[PDB]
């Protein structure tokens, strides 16, 4: 709640800015490494998010190509960073582990 | 020397739900949840919704994922099936008696906590096409679906199968809505075989108290008439000719039921001449070679269709239909015996008794009765009911078919199949 | 994260392949031994004492 | 005794590709030796042009 | 509440009785208002010679077409009139005629069955009419790929034995069979000690017995003696029959190894492993999540339209395997997976899956013995094949005894490194070569 939470939060906000994907207009979940669980979750995204996600990634690849970056104004502010993919991925993991528990019996 | 049997126990909860159980001390158990959610409840904006629904009995629920429903049930060697008619959907579950609790839970989940997840629903749409293709490979199905679309302008005209233009288009929100407004306490009945009344009633009062749908077993089937024709080339022409008859449970319905056996329904003997079949003898006389004929009798909550069904060579359609019709006409004109109505009676009664010999059939009769009549009628009184059909009632049923507006569906090479106009 | 392979079934599976995995080691043992004419090992074998 | 031979041989040693292999490797051991005996013994019998020369020239 | 176990002890014991004849009259009383009565005869096609072949099948066609006391059409009129159902069937070892009837109708029901069984009026006009009918049947049977493939499978598996033969016979026999030919078959076969009068429902075994004596009295009494052969064992061959026809759109394939036969206790375990592999059909709800790896992989990769395991039992031999239907480019894959499962079960059946298979069987058995007909058929067949009637309690006991070790032991005996009988029909260009189908019957790791 107090100084303590803000400190961790500000340590997190610091790394975020240092990680620097926001400079390419990206979002945390856009940088997630695609594995089986991730592929399925990407698959389950509804039309809108999936479309936005592809354009974001395209904007970035395009930048990373000419090794430019976005104007400061358009970086993605921490806070404002939507974990759109998270709930889907969590459910995909939660599903797999169920098969995995079933496979032990 | 078997033990003396139990009596079925029946209970109407004040919220509308019905519960019925029989303790046949069977090694297996049959639990079924019957709902007035059949195809007649779809409307022109959501056709096929109850088909897709019928096919999604194992998508994930709250408290049971798809994988769990499947694995859980097969682990005990259980079954989950959903069966539909234009009026009801009937989710039945079966397993050995030591496992009813796990199967009951799953049942409750499929019927009361379905999640219809976008991606599971999308993955399931193509099954409509497979499911429909497999059914429609019997000529009868297209025919009876056309029969009904031609006979009614409403509700009962809907088909058991999704229209092609709707395949791929039914939405999860439509599935949610169909369940919410049809799977409610007042439109539901819970039948138990091999379980006990207190367990059923306990389950009912705990999990089946849901109300917020609609009310009656009707938008109300308007009977219309008219006919539908499907050119085909199948060598055999399939045709059905019908008129509005009687609503199920009404006394006129048993007259039709008996008329059906006077005229003739299925065969009783492997490869027989069908001697006691008025229709089959009457067509025989004027037709020499491949054909079948049967009286047809469908009865619903607020209507019914009665007539006959013919299968004949493309060139004999006219003759087979015409002769078959003339033979009903004959019974309408009063030319019906007494040992005839009697034989019909004995074929009906025995047929019924035989129909509820197994569990699968007993539970379905009980389930549908509960849903159509809100009661349970024992075999002895159904027999009494058939017994009260009088010769004139059968004659009147026949009379009603002859003079009533017709409905015909036919498929095959129709070049010699009469129009109605010409019957 | 090898916990995925830890349970009753997996344990039954391991027992089922034990005679096979054992016999496959018997094959590899004799196999190397014979192929290198293992002086150390072969001396014990009757009739294969070609010295 | 004869049918049951090929039979028992199949029963106890041939099904399991394990034993099937265990035997051929073990069977290769005994064979390699017994073949080299007979083979050399054959090479000798048709000859005797060297080796018994030793009994003569040395022995000290 | 009553447990599953308890529920099995509740099932009334099948009552057995024998006439001074050889006719075993057995029944199982219940409280139903309906029943099924019938005659199960030890007559098949495995009992016929190459020229009699089609005899029994021919007799079935005549069976309900007139007796001496009930001519041409009257028998039907009687059955139909009381609302009863008269049916009949013939496999390669068994023949049956049974009636579904109101319980009170038990008297006439039996009186009728007897008449059909002894006084068959094989009138020439009819024996002649039936030959154009049976010929027709063959023509339609030819369009059922599945029926053709199991006929093929028998034909090759049992090369040179009578079990190789089909039930209906070859067309040449259908058109040449004489009345003498039929008369002889009946006399040689339809005789007391080879037939069982069975029933199930609302009847008392006393009644049944009264009737058996009343209308079946006078068969093998002054009979027995000379001209009664036993069945010779049938050599299983292990071969292949591929009927290539690219005009059909799905291929049918049926592979099997030799099974032990009716009496062998080994059948229970075999049935449990089968249950583990199970079946599949494209209309099955739940595809990817199905327990059976075959089914699941099948459903996921769309490797077929359907498959089914089976265990066809004959005296001392049988067919043990699976049948499937698939696209021309999936035959290989399907074969590979099916075989993979047999091997796996032979070498490594886990304990959990054997309980599933067991549960599947208890549910199948109990679910199958539901309604008079299936039970009457079980009484009649069981007496012909076990000599006893095996109480559910015992089958449970037998199922119960199976665990994983048993599965991998028993499966190994019949499947591991054995030669299959393979039957292929349809667009089978990719049906694997026999050598390769045979190589898939064992594996190098094991």
UniProtKB/Swiss-Prot annotation, chain A:
One of its GO terms (biological process) is mitochondrial electron transport, ubiquinol to cytochrome c. Component of the ubiquinol-cytochrome c oxidoreductase (cytochrome b-c1 complex, complex III, CIII), a multisubunit enzyme composed of 11 subunits. The complex is composed of 3 respiratory subunits cytochrome b, cytochrome c1 and Rieske protein UQCRFS1, 2 core protein subunits UQCRC1/QCR1 and UQCRC2/QCR2, and 6 low-molecular weight protein subunits UQCRH/QCR6, UQCRB/QCR7, UQCRQ/QCR8, UQCR10/QCR9, UQCR11/QCR10 and subunit 9, the cleavage product of Rieske protein UQCRFS1. The modification N6-acetyllysine is found at residues 13, 72, 77, 82, 90. SUPFAM superfamilies: 14 kDa protein of cytochrome bc1 complex (Ubiquinol-cytochrome c reductase) (SSF81524). It comes from the Eukaryota. Component of the ubiquinol-cytochrome c oxidoreductase, a multisubunit transmembrane complex that is part of the mitochondrial electron transport chain which drives oxidative phosphorylation. The keyword Transport applies. This is Cytochrome b-c1 complex subunit 7. Transmembrane segments: none annotated. The modification N6-succinyllysine is found at residues 72, 82. Belongs to the UQCRB/QCR7 family. GO terms for cellular component: mitochondrial inner membrane; respiratory chain complex III. Gene3D superfamilies: Cytochrome b-c1 complex subunit 7 (1.10.1090.10). Its main location: mitochondrion. It comes from Bos taurus (Bovine).
From Swiss-Prot, chain B:
Its main location: mitochondrion. GO terms for molecular function: metal ion binding; metalloendopeptidase activity. Keywords: Acetylation, Electron transport, Membrane, Mitochondrion, Mitochondrion inner membrane, Respiratory chain, Transit peptide, Transport. It is found in: Mitochondrion inner membrane. It is a peripheral membrane protein. The modification N6-acetyllysine is found at residues 36, 169, 220. It comes from the Eukaryota. It holds the Pfam family Peptidase_M16_C. The keyword Transit peptide applies. SUPFAM superfamilies: LuxS/MPP-like metallohydrolase. PROSITE patterns: INSULINASE. One of its GO terms (biological process) is proteolysis. GO terms for cellular component: mitochondrial inner membrane; mitochondrion. The keyword Transmembrane does not apply. Component of the ubiquinol-cytochrome c oxidoreductase (cytochrome b-c1 complex, complex III, CIII), a multisubunit enzyme composed of 11 subunits. The complex is composed of 3 respiratory subunits cytochrome b, cytochrome c1 and Rieske protein UQCRFS1, 2 core protein subunits UQCRC1/QCR1 and UQCRC2/QCR2, and 6 low-molecular weight protein subunits UQCRH/QCR6, UQCRB/QCR7, UQCRQ/QCR8, UQCR10/QCR9, UQCR11/QCR10 and subunit 9, the cleavage product of Rieske protein UQCRFS1. Belongs to the peptidase M16 family. UQCRC2/QCR2 subfamily. Component of the ubiquinol-cytochrome c oxidoreductase, a multisubunit transmembrane complex that is part of the mitochondrial electron transport chain which drives oxidative phosphorylation. PANTHER family: CYTOCHROME B-C1 COMPLEX SUBUNIT 2, MITOCHONDRIAL, METALLOPROTEASE. This is Cytochrome b-c1 complex subunit 2, mitochondrial. It comes from Bos taurus.
From Swiss-Prot, chain C:
One of its GO terms (cellular component) is mitochondrial inner membrane. This is Cytochrome b-c1 complex subunit 10. Keywords: Electron transport, Membrane, Mitochondrion, Mitochondrion inner membrane, Respiratory chain, Transmembrane, Transmembrane helix, Transport. The keyword Transmembrane helix applies. Belongs to the UQCR11/QCR10 family. Signal peptide: none annotated. It is a single-pass membrane protein. It comes from Bos taurus (Bovine). The chain crosses the membrane at residues 13-35. Component of the ubiquinol-cytochrome c oxidoreductase (cytochrome b-c1 complex, complex III, CIII), a multisubunit enzyme composed of 11 subunits. The complex is composed of 3 respiratory subunits cytochrome b, cytochrome c1 and Rieske protein UQCRFS1, 2 core protein subunits UQCRC1/QCR1 and UQCRC2/QCR2, and 6 low-molecular weight protein subunits UQCRH/QCR6, UQCRB/QCR7, UQCRQ/QCR8, UQCR10/QCR9, UQCR11/QCR10 and subunit 9, the cleavage product of Rieske protein UQCRFS1. Residues 36-51 are mitochondrial intermembrane. It is found in: Mitochondrion inner membrane. Residues 1-12 are mitochondrial matrix. GO terms for biological process: mitochondrial electron transport, ubiquinol to cytochrome c. The keyword Membrane applies. Component of the ubiquinol-cytochrome c oxidoreductase, a multisubunit transmembrane complex that is part of the mitochondrial electron transport chain which drives oxidative phosphorylation. It comes from the Eukaryota.
UniProtKB/Swiss-Prot annotation, chain E:
It is found in: Mitochondrion inner membrane. The modification Phosphoserine is found at residue 178. GO terms for molecular function: metal ion binding. Its main location: mitochondrion. The modification N6-succinyllysine is found at residue 129. Keywords: Acetylation, Electron transport, Membrane, Mitochondrion, Mitochondrion inner membrane, Phosphoprotein, Respiratory chain, Transit peptide, Transport. Component of the ubiquinol-cytochrome c oxidoreductase, a multisubunit transmembrane complex that is part of the mitochondrial electron transport chain which drives oxidative phosphorylation. Belongs to the peptidase M16 family. UQCRC1/QCR1 subfamily. This is Cytochrome b-c1 complex subunit 1, mitochondrial.
